[PDB]
Design a binder for these strands. Structure first.
Lengths: 228, 215
RNA sequence: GGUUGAAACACGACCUGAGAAA
């Protein structure tokens, strides 16, 4: 097989203020002992902020002032995994956290050449809530730009994220899944829509597949024209 | 006094095939220890350039970087439609590492008028006491658009929210949703619900409407 | 400042130069 460089993160999620969390960054395709590993985070609507790093051979560690004394970076070479242990969490620590490999000096200088997928840490006292899913019904009488449109409204969920597919992933053309919006209740909502041929309504079935892992919610909703 | 990286412009909009440049000035010397990244929203950044002017293996050759003193430049020689992203510079001359504030790159294209659809709330949702009315504006350009809600011909205020997709990776368009939230009691009190859309692709504003309970 | 040891420190080899905290 081809060996691919990969960083797989885990351990993020919802945590109460003042609480603790440990993030993991499991590496494959290279031995972490011989690389510097970094953590970088991105708060909602903000840029990238460097958080911490650990050096090869020495295991020397470095921290941003914003986390010094509260966060600890480490590496277990016997598991090829790096960690970010976070204590005394504040709302300001809410962010997507990424682990990154600093590349090999002669090939990449100090650039970070591979990154984990990100894990979302939400510092809040609010409770997990699964969404309700409602149809956005289409009509052969409601055509614009040469198509009909239908969709699913995903409402009152917490924390992020939710994902939506259509017909178990078989329908992707014309699908638009909008970014989540925070409502005044403190819960999120989003819609997912698709444009389809008007001739197809009644000949074709459209099911939206909604996933909200924090609540273990998996919901399929059939969307059909109303009998009217 | 941490080293600051000052990026410019804050955003830019350029057409496919255009030459685009983005700059980043370090507040003091960082030697050549500057990297450039491309980031799609909510995704990991991708390394483009390292040590100010070296192209990371596998990155397309339209990307390049250069240094003049404390000023660093990223150039895209011929913009491609998937190149929309926020681009960041980073210094790793000393700890702590610092990043520029990002430059948002949008793909400029011709005007495209939106297709408009209105959706009444479902009977299922009404049973729980709230009504959501949805207006969809599909596959339009540029991003700027106005959505006005009217209930029995009365302009609505303060009770709607909008969300927009990122640009289509093939033809560079956006889509937009506007959701009007009403109590069930307020929804049942009125008959005509309308979404009015103004956008430079449309000669005249487009209104989509329905009558509550009337199919 | 640059090359280089899987290597910013620690543990090593070098180049430019009066000196790489230049």
């Amino acid at each position: 097989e081809i060996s691919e460089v990969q960083l797989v993160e885990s351990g993020g999620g919802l945590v109460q203020p003042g609480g603790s969390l440990r993030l993991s960054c499991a590496a494959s395709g290279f031995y972490i002992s011989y690389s510097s590993i970094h953590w970088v985070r991105q708060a909602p609507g903000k840029g990238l902020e460097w958080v911490a790093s650990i050096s090869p051979y020495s295991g020397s560690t470095y921290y941003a002032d914003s986390v010094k004394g509260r966060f600890t970076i480490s590496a277990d070479t016997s598991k090829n995994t790096a960690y970010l242990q976070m204590n005394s969490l504040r709302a300001e620590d809410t962010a997507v956290y990424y682990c990154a490999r600093q590349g090999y000096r002669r090939r990449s200088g100090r650039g970070f050449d591979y990154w984990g997928q990100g894990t979302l840490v939400t510092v809040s006292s609010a409770s997990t809530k699964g969404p309700s899913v409602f149809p956005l019904a289409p009509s052969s009488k409601s055509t614009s730009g040469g198509t009909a449109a239908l969709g699913c409204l995903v409402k009152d969920y917490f924390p992020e994220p939710v994902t939506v597919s259509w017909n178990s992933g078989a329908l992707t053309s014309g699908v638009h899944t909008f970014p989540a919006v925070l409502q005044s209740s403190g819960l999120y909502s989003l819609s997912s829509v698709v444009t389809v041929p008007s001739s197809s309504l009644g000949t074709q079935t459209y099911i939206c597949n909604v996933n909200h892992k924090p609540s273990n919610t998996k919901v399929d909703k059939k969307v059909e024209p109303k009998s009217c | 006094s941490d080293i600051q990286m000052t990026q410019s412009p804050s955003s830019l909009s350029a057409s496919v095939g255009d030459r685009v440049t983005i700059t980043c000035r370090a507040s003091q010397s960082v030697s050549s220890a500057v990297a450039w990244y491309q980031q799609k929203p909510g995704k990991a950044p991708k390394l483009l350039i390292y040590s100010a002017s070296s192209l990371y293996s596998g990155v397309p050759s339209r990307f390049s970087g250069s240094r003049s003193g404390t000023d660093f430049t990223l150039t895209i020689s011929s913009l491609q439609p998937e190149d929309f992203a926020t681009y960041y510079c980073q210094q790793s001359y000393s700890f702590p590492s610092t990043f520029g504030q990002g430059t948002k790159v949008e793909i400029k294209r011709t005007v495209a008028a939106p297709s408009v659809f209105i959706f009444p709330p479902s009977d299922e949702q009404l049973k729980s006491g709230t009504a959501s009315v949805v207006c969809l504006l599909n596959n339009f350009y540029p991003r700027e658009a106005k959505v006005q809600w009217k209930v029995d011909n009365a302009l609505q205020s303060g009770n709607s929210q909008e969300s927009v997709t990122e640009q289509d990776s093939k033809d560079s368009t956006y889509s937009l949703s506007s959701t009007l939230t009403l109590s069930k009691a307020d929804y049942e009190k009125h008959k005509v619900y309308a979404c009015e859309v103004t956008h430079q692709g449309l000669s005249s504003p487009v209104t989509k409407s329905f009558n509550r309970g009337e199919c």
